């Protein structure tokens, strides 16, 4: 029974077998891997990618659909032509022996045959051949979820506890969260809502089991981590996205969470889809988001090094020179200040918000945009930085060269903002500042913030299950010796001095075999030494895609002299340049 | 500096990247949105840009016959991608000439939806694939500039305007380059063009760019994957390019070691020509009769 | 940041909750008018429900104690026998509405209600509408209980629309039944068959299960046709219920009312394709197919007028539809434009190269090769299926301009090319415009009379766009005298006697139906006459109506160019060339006049049944002054209830204003110069082209969505007009429940719930039923469509909703809701507050004897509209101002209606409430229906209900009230020395219809209430006179009936026929 599959978003096509990417745990046991026969051939993604520039959405499907599964050859110089289960990327006839696989997620836009999905799905719902990914596991295909005969209690259904980089496993766990278990131990029915694309090692390392009513209030960090990296949370069953809350939000506050089943556990590829450069990447999360639980809380729970806190440039670091300065720029306006505040909280907008925003937006242009343009190399030149803004206007008004990934968090930030103790001013001063930091957003779809946390803190979740020690290799630039001494400085023994621009952790001596001493030079590297710190600017910008997979670079890396004892007296100021290699 | 920004509750939910304007918000932003969406829904249903000679004309406008600038290269920016560029068969003389960029990647009509790494280092001056991604932005701006030489369309005029019958106000906009931003102007434009480009056939590829699908989350009770047209696919990459500003790899030879990487929202084509008439059309008809 | 902000912050915190639990949140009208983008994805109709079709979980509420030291053997749990009990055995076993609690079948619908048991709060299923931000967290809104109950039942009757499906009926080899083939599974096997339980000791469960008849279990009579294949339907008895079965049976009746046999489906496909697409069906019995594909035409006319409402009324609507049709039209046509033939027939007219003006050069000049691929011919052909919407106006730039006589040769050819490309445009006033162009071109020699003042003969011809300003000489050529205008009478004679008479042809099938609003069903109109499609080799003919129209305007402009006022100015040699060009133009062997009369109707009648939008046409009318369609207008509001009974239809209806500008010189080239391949069989070339468009059943998606937009327009006309007081002709079984906010703002919040329920239950993602709440008033939402001709004859076409099915499913839920409200935690009757210091048992919900003091009784005085209290001085008790406004004293019996108590709980709680618990006065709380909450308690202990009741008054606002709390003793299994408790709140009518059983495990209830398992809910199990059927549905909800398990197979289009 053939099964057509149109690849899901961030589909891993390289370094992972199709079975690993189209719902892994198909490839867990050998009693369940051998029943599948993948037909996703190598030429077909290169044969059909050249033709989809003109073939029509419908037209391509009709030409493509009629075809046998093991095809024959064709023509002069041999261009190949355009078991129990037969997985295939070719959309077949969708008959009684052909089931369309539905993975409850958006299809990618890199695949050329992904236009065929709204036509194949509508043809599948008029029959019943709309297969969920859990039905690939059991012995008989049923197009439905939790069927009559099979109480899904086999070990393959748990979807947990399972070089080796740039391709993390990912679950879309649906978790029932009951309310207060009051009234003689009987529990109110509560609700269930799925959290899409949670990385599996974030659940495995925190010892989360697939069926145990865990406490929730304490939020706990393991749910707050799984909400942060998690791509989206959607009411279970139907596609409505719902923002959770953490504060004293409403009654019945979801005291207990339990992960129930794991709908679609697959491996996605996060090579360089949000972050593009190996320099610095910022997020434009709103004011009351949860920046403090992935900067330090997630690396506090581990003993390795996902971060380095000298970078990780937080938002309101331009308060480091403002909150009591914006507040001192409106104590004069009375009722349109108080009246104005209500409008941000309420659905509608009034005229009092205009005289508060234009008191802010005339104030932001005078103080912070100088204080952000003066903060240039801390943002993008610290080796590897990570930043945090309130808007993309915050880092584009000052001409700061960083990729500005926008960010939406699946936790409602305003109701977290109103339970903010000990803040400057009141809590209502935050909401005046939050709406002022929201209207300069510039209407760009907010990319889900979990998509970036599943790439920076993504592969570092995979580290405690490697069962192999890590091998540090360093991207290192080399200073000529007399350039230091010709600036008032003194160096020892007059040898070329090497500064490690970026560290990285290969796992099996793979990067070294080919990568070492290969001198990739497309991004040139220029180090500047000043009174106590050195900044590194890559003049051809070092892209994250050129970094081979399984390299694992740590977030927020600061630049260190490879022999810091060689320098004597830290004399002078000066900027040199270098080409760099790995070692 | 904007004294009246669009509020963030005036847009719809996102549809992949760009957002639509709500019908409620009137003002000068609504007339800009309505004059651009109505022109985009005229370009998307047209037989003119499907002729092969009109394609070869449009590829001839991108490699500049006159002008150009010191663009850096492509394969130091295609290490983001997988596509390796052409190299000299024989000793090569031209260095990164706009023409060469065309020469570097001409395998898939001067572009390839395998080349989505057009957003890495733009506008290199102290790109032929960003000029070709900006196809439907100056296709619509050449419909707004329908009514639009000096010897007979200016010299005769200047004279008629100067005669002491008719008094004449001359309107010169200072920094019309640095006023087109994605915070107000360039988001209404890319919002309106992506709305007008639905009256075309939604599976029609344009200029070698296919017809991908999109998230479409503009209704909170039903987000659904929707196949957008070919011209809308350029708008999703224009909105991912206009919002990140324009890179500038300025390395002046006057100052010695001055090498840079500069992002801003200014372009050194005819849109800040095209926005002039429609924004004065709203002045004389709606704004100035409202209060003077 | 003071009190002004602080209240908002606190208010905001409470009114946040709709971002969590409710999938459908009424009226967050961010996107009210939502565009019907041409990507209708279709709904999911076929969901199996392999579990047991029930929706009322028998819930083990308060559990029986595991007492082990003292008094052993009173309780007998089935857990000690390693077995699960079919009936719950706690000390109280409530029945509750928990939808799809035992639905372990395929998939899930979503949008399912689940009432918590009455020990919990259960006021979060009645805050679905009119309760966010008005009310707080722990209250229910009594002024809008009817609107919230009706939406709660609408989620009940939508989450149950599944198809029953049989599992594997294995035999039962164990000794409990011996060979009775039950439906085997893995936990709800002993729980779905209560007659199959091993009964150890005589429990309170077991003395009801011992009366279970032993042949009311398992399958009954499976009706399989083909031996060896899967069965058709199997009748079986198991734990279902009569209410959920009827919703699940009226949905299979819905699917059988949109499925036709394989000899019917094939005919429909052939009719749609005009009999060329070749498909065969195997004449052999397929025993089980269900193809829910074909809606009737009365529902399809509703989907069409819905898709004209939620779309922009202007020019934006016409373009997608026309372009989409145009793309198909150009794609499958045999006709290939090739303008070299027109070029080689013009440029080979020998003119002289000594005149300064070359006539030949001029005609070629205007006719251009601008890159146009002549889609303006196909945007003028495809704009004939939508001439009610878009009308093709001649472009304003392409007229021969004024200040230019007929001597001007570029302004002479523009008058010719306007005439040839006259009737290709579907514009009502085009004929006048074509005539006007020439009459304004020579307005010096030939003066005619323009019928109105305000314009003259030398007016630009583009302004002649109203029907009244047609010149009377053109309406009647006898008024033009040939002594003055010999040339302009001949044009008005030529237009009135050569313009093509409109005709008609059929499209689609008459079995499937058609969404034609104004034309008769499955008929299309056409501005030229038509002939059937030929199967022979075709050649260009000259006896068509188009080639006659071409060869008469050319023969007219020859007479123009050889007139007397033309031969005076132009040289006599160049008019030989101008006569030479035109006479070489009428003789071009063009295929396009054969294409319009023959191939293009069969081209149009196939594409009109494969498009995403069916053709909306209005009747064509050439040349008639009184019957020009000025407006085609569609209404979304019933004007009889708006007061607008007799105003004109241009006011009560919304007019379409679309106008595609087309160019003559891009049409005249395609008109005069199309050709085809020589060996062209037109029937073969369409069957080679229409075969991919009929390849699969995605054509029946527009057909399948029209059932839902029928069945969601009725439930948004029912639920709106059933909430508010006396609307349409909808029955109101929910009418005792109080509804006060009947405003137009509340009616939009109910329709936005019914819209968001159907958008979630079926998962269809277009813009179904969202068009109406555009004017803000959805309580008069009725669809209509009409067109007003200039004579005044307006064809009003009412479109009513079809005979829906979920109309009479929701009318069956609310009919049985009023007898079984206690299963949904609503209660009937009132609420008393007398002091009762009982030592024995207490039962608030089920009161014995007569209630004391019903309203209107002797000495029972009603509190006034304010509830105000006048204090009396110096040692008199403060009186209470009563209904008759004369201050009676508190010590007595009062009727305190809930609206008065909602605005007086600071006067109730201080004055008349201390006279309740002092045993002095006895109030009545006259509230109609309410949610109740049952706080149980250990009876052998001190317990006062006064802190519970004082808590209940503290949460009462002018907004809503919290659910009424009742203290009920836990029924003990032994006689107990009970403390005397002081209770207060007890209801009036017997609201204890949900106590399924009490302390079922025990051997006997010895104190509280021995409300044992009533065999009126179970007569399928424990009754001798029970028959199959006999679902006494309106009166009570059964719990064990004989249902049907269908075993359908849903094939594709390739599973029915063979298409090649």
XYZ file of C-alpha atoms in Angstrom, chain B residues 15-288:
274
model
C -0.094 35.750 5.350
C 3.414 34.331 5.308
C 5.342 37.580 5.488
C 3.350 40.586 4.317
C 0.185 41.870 5.983
C -2.974 43.322 4.515
C -4.396 46.656 5.540
C -7.773 46.597 7.246
C -10.642 48.328 5.409
C -11.446 50.513 8.414
C -8.302 52.651 8.497
C -8.790 55.650 6.248
C -6.342 58.504 5.915
C -3.388 59.065 3.597
C -2.282 55.477 4.134
C -5.541 54.175 2.696
C -5.285 56.120 -0.549
C -1.712 54.913 -0.991
C -2.899 51.363 -0.394
C -5.856 51.743 -2.726
C -3.875 53.297 -5.566
C -1.278 50.537 -5.413
C -3.557 47.541 -4.968
C -5.705 48.727 -7.872
C -2.623 49.019 -10.065
C -1.300 45.630 -8.987
C -4.596 44.024 -9.956
C -4.148 45.488 -13.419
C -0.621 44.167 -13.920
C -1.458 40.644 -12.755
C -4.112 40.255 -15.461
C -2.207 41.389 -18.518
C -0.896 39.658 -21.652
C 2.040 42.026 -22.033
C 4.570 40.368 -19.737
C 4.196 36.796 -21.010
C 5.661 37.478 -24.438
C 9.253 36.214 -24.677
C 10.515 39.487 -26.154
C 9.103 41.384 -23.177
C 11.039 39.034 -20.911
C 14.302 39.674 -22.763
C 13.636 43.407 -22.519
C 13.094 43.051 -18.768
C 16.324 41.095 -18.355
C 18.053 43.836 -20.364
C 16.898 46.494 -17.899
C 18.506 44.664 -14.971
C 22.044 44.429 -16.306
C 22.389 48.158 -16.850
C 23.311 49.257 -20.351
C 24.408 52.527 -18.729
C 25.326 53.062 -15.106
C 25.811 50.235 -12.677
C 27.984 50.216 -9.598
C 30.778 48.255 -7.951
C 28.817 45.196 -6.908
C 30.988 42.867 -4.831
C 30.437 39.377 -6.251
C 28.017 36.497 -5.807
C 29.745 33.298 -4.646
C 31.066 34.921 -1.483
C 27.355 35.567 -0.922
C 26.225 32.200 -2.323
C 28.043 30.278 0.387
C 24.643 30.788 1.968
C 23.331 28.854 -1.048
C 24.504 25.751 -2.855
C 24.674 27.195 -6.367
C 28.212 27.491 -7.631
C 28.706 30.370 -10.148
C 30.491 30.404 -13.477
C 34.253 30.981 -13.743
C 36.475 31.945 -16.668
C 37.026 29.382 -19.450
C 39.844 31.675 -20.580
C 41.525 34.626 -18.874
C 38.715 36.805 -17.607
C 38.928 40.596 -17.758
C 35.608 41.991 -16.521
C 35.415 42.158 -12.757
C 31.969 41.614 -11.307
C 30.310 43.740 -13.961
C 26.557 43.853 -13.557
C 26.693 41.937 -16.844
C 28.999 39.391 -15.195
C 26.509 38.807 -12.383
C 24.087 37.784 -15.120
C 26.904 35.647 -16.543
C 27.607 34.162 -13.115
C 24.142 32.646 -12.735
C 22.157 32.327 -15.946
C 21.321 28.631 -15.605
C 17.693 29.063 -14.589
C 16.492 32.156 -16.449
C 18.860 34.510 -14.566
C 17.441 33.159 -11.292
C 16.328 29.886 -9.687
C 13.941 29.238 -6.840
C 17.018 27.377 -5.663
C 18.489 30.888 -5.363
C 16.461 32.236 -2.442
C 19.685 33.616 -0.955
C 19.174 36.991 -2.603
C 18.930 38.519 0.899
C 22.547 38.334 2.087
C 24.486 41.407 0.917
C 22.550 43.881 -1.194
C 23.132 47.143 -3.013
C 26.926 47.010 -3.017
C 28.113 50.570 -3.643
C 30.433 53.091 -2.030
C 22.540 42.931 -7.642
C 20.998 41.389 -10.747
C 18.989 38.863 -8.728
C 17.618 41.551 -6.413
C 16.779 43.687 -9.416
C 14.975 40.616 -10.727
C 13.250 39.974 -7.412
C 12.095 43.606 -7.613
C 10.320 42.891 -10.903
C 6.738 43.486 -9.640
C 7.733 46.571 -7.694
C 8.744 48.616 -10.724
C 6.162 46.886 -12.873
C 3.438 48.480 -10.774
C 5.333 51.762 -10.417
C 5.406 51.971 -14.208
C 1.622 51.804 -14.119
C 1.282 54.610 -11.587
C 3.708 56.624 -13.729
C 1.503 56.374 -16.786
C 1.295 60.147 -17.245
C 5.015 60.519 -16.318
C 11.972 65.306 -22.887
C 13.383 68.322 -21.136
C 13.412 70.365 -24.298
C 9.714 69.846 -24.945
C 8.090 68.720 -21.717
C 9.911 70.858 -19.209
C 11.297 73.899 -20.948
C 7.925 74.695 -22.463
C 6.366 74.170 -19.080
C 8.681 75.973 -16.749
C 7.767 78.859 -19.018
C 4.013 78.483 -18.784
C 4.233 78.146 -15.012
C 6.316 81.288 -14.723
C 3.879 83.657 -16.447
C 2.296 86.171 -14.044
C -1.238 85.039 -14.705
C -0.951 81.742 -12.840
C 0.813 81.730 -9.490
C 2.877 78.592 -9.033
C 3.940 76.587 -5.995
C 6.934 74.359 -6.732
C 7.135 71.303 -4.495
C 10.543 69.695 -3.955
C 10.779 66.755 -1.557
C 14.073 66.633 0.318
C 15.423 63.100 0.831
C 12.710 61.262 -1.077
C 15.130 58.361 -0.959
C 15.327 58.350 2.836
C 11.585 58.694 3.358
C 10.501 55.363 1.871
C 10.676 53.016 4.848
C 9.025 49.750 5.775
C 7.586 51.381 8.898
C 4.909 53.133 6.815
C 5.543 53.566 3.092
C 7.092 50.335 1.883
C 4.801 48.090 3.933
C 1.631 49.608 2.510
C 3.157 49.110 -0.952
C 4.110 45.459 -0.486
C 0.822 44.936 1.314
C -1.179 46.384 -1.559
C 0.703 44.585 -4.323
C 0.202 41.240 -2.608
C -3.520 41.970 -2.475
C -3.777 43.082 -6.087
C -1.834 40.049 -7.274
C -4.698 37.682 -6.481
C -6.862 38.576 -9.480
C -4.233 36.881 -11.562
C -4.311 33.134 -11.844
C -3.142 31.923 -8.451
C -1.023 29.160 -9.971
C 0.634 31.306 -12.632
C 4.415 31.514 -12.363
C 5.993 34.814 -13.171
C 9.329 35.515 -14.755
C 10.766 32.180 -13.771
C 9.619 32.218 -10.172
C 7.136 29.469 -9.428
C 3.907 29.595 -7.442
C 4.662 28.491 -3.894
C 2.150 28.123 -1.065
C 1.915 30.340 2.016
C 0.822 30.077 5.648
C -2.158 32.519 5.525
C -2.990 33.102 9.178
C -5.160 36.166 8.682
C -8.240 34.523 10.207
C -7.900 33.375 13.829
C -10.485 30.596 13.512
C -9.115 29.109 10.265
C -5.521 29.448 9.111
C -5.032 27.409 5.968
C -2.232 26.814 3.472
C -2.978 28.762 0.316
C -1.203 28.634 -3.071
C -0.132 32.131 -4.033
C 0.765 33.234 -7.547
C 4.225 33.698 -8.991
C 4.193 37.475 -8.616
C 3.132 37.182 -4.990
C 6.186 34.994 -4.373
C 8.404 37.935 -5.265
C 6.450 40.088 -2.806
C 7.124 37.644 0.034
C 10.826 38.039 -0.750
C 10.542 41.784 -1.275
C 8.979 42.097 2.170
C 11.789 39.969 3.562
C 14.244 42.321 1.853
C 12.669 45.738 2.394
C 12.175 45.072 6.104
C 15.804 44.112 6.688
C 16.907 47.250 4.867
C 19.656 47.446 2.288
C 23.193 46.274 2.988
C 25.978 48.582 1.835
C 29.535 47.302 1.543
C 31.043 50.783 1.236
C 34.838 50.677 1.065
C 36.064 54.113 0.024
C 39.496 54.564 -1.518
C 39.874 58.095 -0.136
C 40.067 56.993 3.480
C 42.611 54.206 3.757
C 41.436 51.204 5.778
C 37.768 52.244 5.813
C 35.801 49.080 5.049
C 32.221 48.737 6.219
C 28.943 46.886 6.308
C 26.113 49.401 6.364
C 22.373 48.686 6.611
C 19.820 51.354 5.787
C 16.477 51.884 4.082
C 17.538 54.102 1.146
C 17.967 53.025 -2.476
C 20.545 55.106 -4.482
C 14.149 53.074 -8.531
C 11.077 54.936 -9.745
C 8.803 54.285 -6.763
C 9.758 57.426 -4.866
C 8.931 59.011 -8.171
C 5.660 57.049 -8.279
C 4.491 57.900 -4.764
C 4.641 61.626 -5.488
C 1.456 61.954 -7.530
C -0.799 59.730 -5.445
C 0.151 61.472 -2.226
C -0.629 64.866 -3.724
C -3.850 63.493 -5.210
C -4.980 62.877 -1.637
C -3.919 66.372 -0.606
C -5.952 68.442 -3.060
C -9.050 66.269 -2.814
C -9.356 64.997 0.762
C -6.848 66.533 3.169
C -6.757 70.203 2.199
